[PDB]
Structures are given as structure tokens and as C-alpha cells.
């Protein structure tokens, strides 16, 4: 029979496991956190070799039944390295139905990230993929090159370096396009992605309305205030509104 294996983030691998008990076969799927959008096809040991975009229409005796989307929407396990993606311009189909990039409502923030649709709290909205570099590197260079750096764990930083900060040059993920707020409606949270691998995602903390801008706390060290000058500014301002 069927096995589902959930990641802590709510995504899952589902399928009949093989003789040796591995997520291996032609009819395995990764199902996104909405429990509707899925990537269906060939996996070996839980790695997506060839996943075709599908909708989960229902389950019978716990067995998922998918409808393929028209096209040849194929996706592949593609962990970044110097290389952000093998398909810089191929969007995440789950992300694409949920967010879009537009001018930010925050004065001189530039661009920002918005909900296409109204969602609940705890809803994963967008992915933060990037190149995978080291803290020493990140911390050895000027802030001007550190606009999109995001701490993944204690060995790894995730970056979206110029010119991938432009959507016409990179749009496989959009998490980096979310602006900072000290009164955020989202957080960065761990996510295990079938294409990007282990990255971070952007998740709502509260219900959000269609066309609201999504914001997160960048969470730079307040006292080592090691941050760019615009953040140091918004911090003085905010703490005044607080103290």
C-alpha cells in the first residue's frame, strides 16, 4: 500500500515504496503544502528525477489520484551550488499561483512581494532559493553585496547575487523580493524543496488579503547594530514608536 512522508514544513513524498522500502518508482509524487499542487513521476530514493506538474484530485483508501496539467511541465532535483539553477526562468508553479512582484508600498524600498490571493495563517507563500556560500565570505565583504544574503544554517548562506535580483534574469523563486518590516505578516522558515533542496520559505503568521504586501523581519544582529544604514534607520524609528 501507500506511504506518505511529511516534511516538518508540510510538504510530502507519497507513493508505493520499493522492495528495499525506498521512495523509488515512476508514480511517486511530491505534494506541496497546499495538499493540492504536486509534482508527479520518477523519483529515486526520494529524489525527483522527473516530476510533471499535477493536481491532487482526491485520495482513495489513502491513495492519491492526480490529474496532469497540460504542457510538458517537467521539473527535476536541481540544488544550487556558483550555479543558482539550471532553469533560472522557469517559475515554481506553486509560488506562481500565490505571489507576484510589484512596486513596494514602502517609500524607496523598491520592489516588493504581494499576495495574489487571500490565505490563512501558517501558509507558505514563496521560496528563498539562491547560491550557497559561506558566512566568512559573506562577512568579509561590504553591505552593498549583502542585500539578498539569508542565513540558512551555521555553515551556509543563501544569496541571490546581481543580476539575479532582477526577475527578467531569475524568477525560479521570489522569496528575495520580500521587504523587511518590524511588524511583519510573515517569517522565514525551513523548507525542504523537491527542486531546490533544503532552503527557506516564506510563511504567513496571520491571515493575509489578496494584494497585501508580504513583509518579513530580516533579523540582523541588533547589538554585536550590524546592518545596512536604511535598516539601522528604520530600527531607531521603530524603537522610538516602541519606547
Amino acid at each position: 500500500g501507500v506511504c506518505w512522508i511529511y516534511y516538518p514544513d508540510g510538504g510530502s513524498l507519497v507513493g508505493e515504496v520499493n522492495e528495499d522500502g525506498e521512495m523509488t518508482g515512476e508514480k511517486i509524487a511530491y505534494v506541496y503544502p497546499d495538499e493540492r499542487t504536486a509534482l508527479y513521476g520518477k523519483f529515486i530514493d526520494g529524489e525527483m528525477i522527473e516530476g510533471k506538474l499535477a493536481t491532487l484530485m482526491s485520495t482513495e483508501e489513502g491513495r492519491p489520484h492526480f490529474e496532469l496539467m497540460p504542457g510538458n511541465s517537467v521539473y527535476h532535483f536541481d540544488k544550487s551550488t556558483s550555479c543558482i539553477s539550471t532553469n533560472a526562468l522557469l517559475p515554481d508553479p506553486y509560488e506562481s499561483e500565490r505571489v507576484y512582484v510589484a512596486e513596494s508600498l514602502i517609500s524607496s524600498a523598491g520592489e516588493g512581494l504581494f499576495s495574489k490571493v487571500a490565505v490563512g495563517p501558517n501558509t507558505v507563500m514563496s521560496f528563498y532559493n539562491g547560491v550557497r556560500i559561506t558566512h566568512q565570505e559573506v562577512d568579509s565583504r561590504d553591505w552593498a553585496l549583502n542585500g539578498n544574503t539569508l542565513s540558512l544554517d551555521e555553515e551556509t548562506v543563501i544569496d541571490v547575487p546581481e543580476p539575479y535580483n532582477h526577475v527578467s534574469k531569475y524568477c525560479a523563486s521570489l522569496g528575495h523580493k520580500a521587504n523587511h518590516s518590524f511588524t511583519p505578516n510573515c517569517i522565514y522558515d525551513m523548507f525542504v524543496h523537491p527542486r531546490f533542496g533544503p532552503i527557506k520559505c516564506i510563511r504567513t503568521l496571520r491571515a493575509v488579503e489578496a494584494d497585501e504586501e508580504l513583509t518579513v523581519a530580516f533579523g540582523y544582529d541588533h547589538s554585536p547594530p550590524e546592518a545596512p544604514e536604511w535598516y539601522q534607520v528604520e530600527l531607531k524609528a521603530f524603537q522610538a514608536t516602541q519606547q
Partner: peptide, 6 residues
């Protein structure tokens, strides 16, 4: 140090 969300 110089990156989001450490």
C-alpha cells in the same frame, strides 16, 4: 553576521 535571520 552580515545576512538575514541568523
Amino acid at each position: 553576521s552580515k545576512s538575514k535571520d541568523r
